């Protein structure tokens, strides 16, 4: 019985777009591993030409603790498998056919079965162009491309939940179709993608770099972001990308993933694997060692995290569902968006409150020791409810400045950072959202039992008091160890 994953990619080709990606390496990792008789995964990657894009395959994938595993199983062999399996494609989102040249862009137009596109720029407070050209008009080089491809049998699409922008309480899955707000002081009440598309770009002085400019862009895309209802430059293109794949995709049948959130890997190739420092991170970072006492943040309130492991088999649970093409369903009626919440604010949800204990008590039972190696002072995370009680301590600076005592006003721009930190990070840890879990909880319910083995994606059997101190911010530490 079940859902046949395993069996599926059965010899299977894909276009892949994250390269250095964090969460699409996992899932080529999670897909060599569970069947290498996989048709080949294509990888997609930046630079300067294809002998310097074969260096980044090595260097940043083949060469990775990641892989370990799958270089254990293949002997001497792995290096050989790896050449047969990952084809380096020096590309670019930014440009047509996703900036691959022609000989070769129409070799993988033919061969393909399974377009994954996790590209992406995830700065939130991001110039417009450039958060535009990616997240928005790249999705549309894809899907344009996607279309002169011969055997295309599912477009996997990788968004936020945050894409759900300032929609409050539960939130269901649902698409979002061309013309779409999220509008339920300043406010827009029709999506002009032709409008925003000019604001962003136009003629841009092509050629002017004053990050003076470079600033006049990203504080405009906030402006839109929020004249339309979305926290920030980001989650508002994200959400134009769905707009854009909705509107294009025509035969073909994309699925759409929401994760919110991703890190370290619960438990798969092995609990702890973590790329890069975006969000919740560089804060857990931060008062791992000198400046946060406390932040700004409802302490009742959630943070929607999952664990990329558990992304990734939600992933490849919708690719063996949704794009084993059929013929009586290609010749009955295009169907819709496969939206896909895979996210924790609805069933487990971690609270603001249980975060500010397990940063305290996984930094204190092994602390960071710092420059001297000398061992870390970090008491608990004290969480404030208004920007009044957050900057009523500045009662730091003065305080925190006792290192000087000995015998017998001072100037804090180091508050003015810790606040400003904590004014940006304000819309999230305020968030209205949850995130309904609810499609991708049918999905389990599909799996075989053998199946919920291999690709575990309840979201369920996470005990964060486990899961943040001792497999999230361990092998966090580690990775950002350079
Ligand atoms: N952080 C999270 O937990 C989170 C949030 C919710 C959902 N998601 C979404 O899921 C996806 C996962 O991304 P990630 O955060 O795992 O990794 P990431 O490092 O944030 O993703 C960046 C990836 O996109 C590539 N990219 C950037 N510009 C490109 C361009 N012009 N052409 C082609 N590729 C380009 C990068 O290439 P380079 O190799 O040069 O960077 C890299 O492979 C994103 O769409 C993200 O928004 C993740």
């Given at each position: 019985?079940?859902?046949?994953?395993?069996?599926?990619?059965?010899?299977?080709?894909?276009?892949?777009?994250?390269?250095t990606?964090?969460?699409?390496?996992?899932?080529?990792e999670?897909?060599?591993?569970t069947?290498?008789?996989?048709g080949?995964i294509?990888?997609?990657?930046?630079?300067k030409?294809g002998?310097?894009?074969?260096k980044?395959?090595?260097?940043?994938?083949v060469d990775?603790?990641?892989?370990?595993?799958?270089?254990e199983?293949?002997?001497?062999?792995?290096?050989?498998?790896?050449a047969?399996?990952?084809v380096?494609?020096?590309?670019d989102?930014?440009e047509?056919?996703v900036?691959?040249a022609?000989?070769?862009?129409?070799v993988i137009?033919?061969?393909?079965?399974?377009?994954?596109?996790?590209a992406?720029?995830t700065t939130?407070?991001?110039?417009?162009d450039?958060?535009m050209?990616?997240?928005?008009?790249?999705?549309?080089?894809?899907?344009?491309?996607?279309?002169?491809?011969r055997?295309?049998?599912?477009?996997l699409?990788?968004?936020?939940?945050?894409?759900n922008?300032?929609?409050?309480?539960?939130?269901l899955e649902?698409?979002?179709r061309?013309g779409?707000?999220?509008?339920?002081?300043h406010?827009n009440t029709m999506?002009?993608?032709?409008?925003?598309?000019?604001?962003?770009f136009?003629?841009?002085?092509?050629?002017?770099?004053?990050?003076?400019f470079?600033?006049?862009?990203?504080?405009?895309?906030?402006?839109?972001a929020?004249?339309?209802?979305?926290?920030?430059?980001y989650?508002?293109?994200?959400?134009?990308?769905?707009?854009v794949?909705?509107?294009?995709r025509?035969?073909?049948?994309?699925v759409?993933?929401?994760?919110?959130?991703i890190?370290?890997?619960?438990?798969?190739p092995?609990?702890?694997?973590?790329?890069?420092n975006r969000?919740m991170?560089?804060?857990?970072?931060?008062?791992?060692?000198?400046?946060?006492?406390?932040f700004?943040?409802?302490?009742?309130?959630?943070?929607?995290?999952?664990?990329?492991d558990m992304?990734?088999?939600?992933?490849?649970?919708?690719?063996?569902?949704?794009?084993r093409?059929?013929?009586?369903?290609?010749?009955?009626?295009a169907?819709?968006?496969?939206?896909?919440?895979?996210?924790s604010?609805?069933?487990?949800?971690?609270?603001?409150?249980?975060?500010?204990?397990?940063?305290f008590?996984?930094?204190?039972?092994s602390?960071?020791?710092?420059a001297?190696?000398r061992?870390?002072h970090?008491?608990?995370?004290?969480?404030?409810?208004?920007?009044?009680?957050?900057?009523?301590?500045?009662?730091?600076?003065?305080l925190?400045?006792?290192?000087?005592?000995?015998?017998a006003?001072?100037?804090?721009?180091?508050?003015?950072?810790?606040?400003?930190?904590?004014?940006i990070?304000?819309?999230?840890?305020?968030?209205?959202?949850?995130?309904?879990?609810?499609?991708?909880?049918?999905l389990?319910?599909?799996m075989?039992?053998?199946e919920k083995?291999?690709?575990?994606?309840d979201?369920?059997?996470?005990?964060?008091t486990?899961?943040?101190?001792?497999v999230?911010?361990?092998?966090?530490?580690?990775?950002?160890?350079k």
């Open positions: 019985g079940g859902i046949g994953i395993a069996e599926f990619l059965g010899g299977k080709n894909f276009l892949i777009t994250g390269g990606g964090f969460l699409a390496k996992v899932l080529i999670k897909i060599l591993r069947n290498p008789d996989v080949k294509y990888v997609l990657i930046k630079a030409d002998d310097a894009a074969l980044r395959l090595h260097n940043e994938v990775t603790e990641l892989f370990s595993r799958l270089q199983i293949h002997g001497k062999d792995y290096h050989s498998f790896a047969r399996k990952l380096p494609v020096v590309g989102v930014r047509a056919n900036g691959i022609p000989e070769l862009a129409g137009a033919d061969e393909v079965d399974i377009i994954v596109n996790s992406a720029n939130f407070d991001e110039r417009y450039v958060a050209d990616i997240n928005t008009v790249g999705p549309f080089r894809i899907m344009s491309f996607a279309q002169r491809f055997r295309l049998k599912l477009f699409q990788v968004s936020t939940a945050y894409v922008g300032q929609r409050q309480g539960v939130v649902k698409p979002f061309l779409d707000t999220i509008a339920k002081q406010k999506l002009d993608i032709e409008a925003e598309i000019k604001l962003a136009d003629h841009r002085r092509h050629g002017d770099d004053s990050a003076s470079s600033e006049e862009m990203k504080e405009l895309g906030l402006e839109r929020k004249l339309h209802g979305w926290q920030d430059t989650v508002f293109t994200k959400a134009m990308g769905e707009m794949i909705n509107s294009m025509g035969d073909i049948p994309v759409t993933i929401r994760p919110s959130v890190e370290s890997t619960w438990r798969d092995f609990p702890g694997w973590m790329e890069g969000m991170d560089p804060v857990v970072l931060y008062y791992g060692k000198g400046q946060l006492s406390g700004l943040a409802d302490p009742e309130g959630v943070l929607d995290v999952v664990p990329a992304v990734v088999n939600a992933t490849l649970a919708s690719m063996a569902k949704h794009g093409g059929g013929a009586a369903a290609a010749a009955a009626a169907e819709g968006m496969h939206v896909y919440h895979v996210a604010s609805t069933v487990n949800p971690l609270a603001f409150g249980d975060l500010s204990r397990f940063l008590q996984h930094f204190t039972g602390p960071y020791s710092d001297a190696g061992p870390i970090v008491p608990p995370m004290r969480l404030f409810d208004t920007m009044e009680q957050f900057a009523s301590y500045v009662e730091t600076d003065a925190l400045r006792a290192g000087r005592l000995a015998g006003e001072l100037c804090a721009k180091s508050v003015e950072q810790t606040i400003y930190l904590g004014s990070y304000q819309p999230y840890t305020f968030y209205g959202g949850r995130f309904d879990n609810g499609n991708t909880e049918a389990i319910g599909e075989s039992e053998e083995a291999r690709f575990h994606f979201v369920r059997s996470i005990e964060w486990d899961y943040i101190t001792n999230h911010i361990p092998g966090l530490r580690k990775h950002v160890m």
